[PDB]
Amino acid sequence: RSRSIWDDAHAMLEKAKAEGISTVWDRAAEQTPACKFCELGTTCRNCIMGPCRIANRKDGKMRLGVCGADADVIVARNFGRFIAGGAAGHSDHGRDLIETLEAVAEGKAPGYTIRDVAKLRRIAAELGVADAATRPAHDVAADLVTICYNDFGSRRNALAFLARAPQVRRDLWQRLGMTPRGVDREIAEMMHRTHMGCDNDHTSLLVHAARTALADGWGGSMIGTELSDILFGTPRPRQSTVNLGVLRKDAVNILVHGHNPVVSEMILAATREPAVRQAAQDAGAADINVAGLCCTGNELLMRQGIPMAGNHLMTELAIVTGAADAIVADYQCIMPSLVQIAACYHTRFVTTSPKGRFTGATHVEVHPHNAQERCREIVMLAIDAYTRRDPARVDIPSQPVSIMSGFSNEAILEALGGTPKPLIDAVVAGQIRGFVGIVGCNNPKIRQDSANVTLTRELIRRDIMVLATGCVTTAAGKAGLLVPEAASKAGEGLAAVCRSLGVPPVLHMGSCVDNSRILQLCALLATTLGVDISDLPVGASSPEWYSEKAAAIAMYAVASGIPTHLGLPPNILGSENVTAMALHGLQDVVGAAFMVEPDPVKAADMLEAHIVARRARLGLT
């Protein structure tokens, strides 16, 4: 119960307890207390002269690694590899989008098209493709593919999308040695620098961690966002629903999980073919019901309006309802426990990526050339599993909650009539005091979504508009804050802006990769006003993060000039020097810093105080 604020979770936790199904919360208890040295970051296993631990003991022993490395170096190396794994999670996704677009450009991807040709030509023109407005769309696409691949090579001095950042920002990065040059290159160089006897200076290591994260935010993730919109459509505001109640007892229920629209968009197509709709009827189902999980669910919500069943700590509970007929997983944040919990039921657990292998799963590998054929086979697996569902163990605990989604930057600018001018006018007038992107996961160390939702309500009450991505999407949707009626929960200034646009006070801007949309928006406003991103009344927050991907997002926010709140510290407190740099030193290096505060009200105060400081620097009330 105290594990979550949500009734639908609470009900499924009782159901799981009675059936003796162990959950992430149960295993989190088993791993408590954790190893102290792992939690502090003062442990190293980068060579077998060790493994080493750094201690603060009276006799003086164990203050240095066998190689002589101290706490500062070891902590910074561990944090660098942490960030690099998060950036890698995003880079490989962007790489898959490049490969998908090239297959469409070559005409080798049945059932795929370029859905947004206008955006294709705009992005291609922006990155330097000649005559992108009038040449055949497939040739334009092939040239865009080439530019994107060059960003995954080793010959550029700066990533292609980095030119969106204001000049003052790029100058700073260049002087600091932070300019990201290559998406994979920066990940590789981080792993190199953290090999023993390479980079042994915590400052140097932290700078390359910022460079690696930037290579994600302005590289892997931004390529991923923009190419997804080209292939699958630019999101436009639309209405949908959220929570475990989006599962229907009377339908074939197919859950997509992971991050890859290249599968999920084609699964959705397969369920619309009239022979497939027929086979589910011949199996007894009223319809075929696709619902989203995690980031692929965020993206299907943004682009098609597909309902979202839950966020990260909802994933196990989504199966305990007994109505999940199949989970279609690709990669990232897919808990391996799901395979065991699925085995307690009729549910098919289907993996589709050669990168996302799970011992004991039904592997049906999906690629652009065979996706239309394989996704149909996958949905046929779900309809068979539907026939084997046990009615005595089905309990869909909730009623779904209405939400509005689809706020790409293109839609935001559309709602403002093509210019950011009305937006900037509202901020100058003090109607919107600032903006905070609330992103990041759930973490069983925090009562699920308590901090996410509490921070959101506080911010909008203070006339701070919230941009929601990732797991916060489900949190704010279940709270009722993703509809225009929620204007009544915002302070007077934000409410009046919200009702004049007919938008909610919390704008869903997509998956964790779509945090690149927030970079793009900040950069646009900074460029429009002639100032740095670190002059904008903005902030970021991850009240309940857990993953390396979220830490990379937090790092590229900070390095880009955005104050960034974290509910929980990364494993760095064993070095006061690294800690002090993350919380303070970075402020006069990149114009922003990390804030660690588990009390969401105090988080709101801190985020709001930074916004006020930036308002005054801009000459605003």
Place this chain on the structure above:
Amino acid sequence: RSRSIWDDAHAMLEKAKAEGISTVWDRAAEQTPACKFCELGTTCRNCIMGPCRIANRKDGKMRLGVCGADADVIVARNFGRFIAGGAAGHSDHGRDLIETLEAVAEGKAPGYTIRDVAKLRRIAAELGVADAATRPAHDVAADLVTICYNDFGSRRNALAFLARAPQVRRDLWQRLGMTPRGVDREIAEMMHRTHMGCDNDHTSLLVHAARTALADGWGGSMIGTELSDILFGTPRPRQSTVNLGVLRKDAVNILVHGHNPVVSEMILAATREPAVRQAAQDAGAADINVAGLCCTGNELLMRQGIPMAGNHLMTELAIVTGAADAIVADYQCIMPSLVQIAACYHTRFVTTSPKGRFTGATHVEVHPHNAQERCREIVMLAIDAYTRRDPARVDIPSQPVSIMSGFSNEAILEALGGTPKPLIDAVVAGQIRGFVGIVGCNNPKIRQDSANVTLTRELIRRDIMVLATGCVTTAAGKAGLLVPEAASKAGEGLAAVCRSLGVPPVLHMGSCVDNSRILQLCALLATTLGVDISDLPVGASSPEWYSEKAAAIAMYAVASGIPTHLGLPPNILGSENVTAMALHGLQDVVGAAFMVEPDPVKAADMLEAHIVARRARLGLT
């Protein structure tokens, strides 16, 4: 004393003890016993739902990570990131060589030339540069640079040098999903796969670890070896000396450390300019004495005959002599303790790489455009530090030992008269029963070089020729086994081959990156005979390894078909499934497996038994 077999080390350990200078051996004692979970690999810190440890306890708790990951997945992920860090250590070195050659090709690198134009044209032709034999050398170089950079991109289906492998080998890799596609790409994908909720199947993870290592051996390292020979000269057999006695009391002593010939070759040039030789005389020195450490020392030994002061556990002791006037470091295996030990003396510790930063060092950053100017400034720093040397604390403990070095494959084939035919004839006749590459470091858990040298003597007595790289170079040289006279220590068949060629029974083939020479030679013989590398009477051994780089070398040897002995296990024993795959399962996957044996005599038996098996499979006595 019992820390090393060597008199020169032993003496310097007494000197360090009397001066109260703590050494790697002392800190190794402090970190003993290590954490059991780190040593077993059953600990995970890849997200802050944890950190987690996997246990085998009666109540059943702590058998799974919070995410549900078990021991098999966690161990395999830790090992994958280990291997990826080793591959990254080599990839970035190869990247720097590409950048150096491009600067030479553009004419933007004063004091650099293409030293081996014949090799440039041969390698360029081999990789597909059109008309590489007759076009201007700089244009050929620019096209080679482009091909190498493409291997550091994301659009190839197989690395360029992989075509050296026999077809049967490439077919196997392709069917297994092991084909390396991109040097940085495979490192990035490994970091992605090991993010939580991605690749959760130990088999899948181990295969991508093999793919990542292959991307090093046939990619990062092979590009690095071949481009170094193009820029700095192909090694030819020559005579030199080894051990701390290569330091001269009467000279300005400059120690190069790390991996980068781009600095060390230019430091050597600076010490030959007549104004620099003059300034050391005006400071009182008889000459300027350059001596090598680690892999840059191996390479300077191979290409210029520069004496080598020591290997990895000699590095601290090289400073305790009191005669080190400067250490010129770049990156990898440079212990941060050296900076503190240098502070106990007059010694200048100079870093030259933006990747190899050390807190408290004199940073003089070297790049191809300014290397000739910066390396001169560096040698001027050494001559100043020479003037401040304390004669009362100088003790050069040994007399140097004569060695022969410089056995590139080009030199081996040269000594055989241009064909491998006489080599193959000796193996068929049973004069050379097989070959073992003994590579890898020192590790203070093993009495220094006891196992390296003991294994070498056993192998050559058994008519098994040894190919030495890395730290083993110093070990076999100090033992007296790197001269043609050492034929008297080999069995009758090898001795007779050795004396007919005037070569030693142990061939120095270079630094740790030059293990790519061994891949090239194996592939050449396999291609010549029409068989796989896993049919050759070959083996590899790392009796005293410590680094991720060495583990990557061991992995790409195994994946390439070469039985590989390790003196110490990597941190994997907490999973019997991963362990059994490394020691046994790999044998029927890739035709070779890891052997873990700390008794070097038993190691010799195991390596020899594999060679006998392959001999019979070939129809040999």
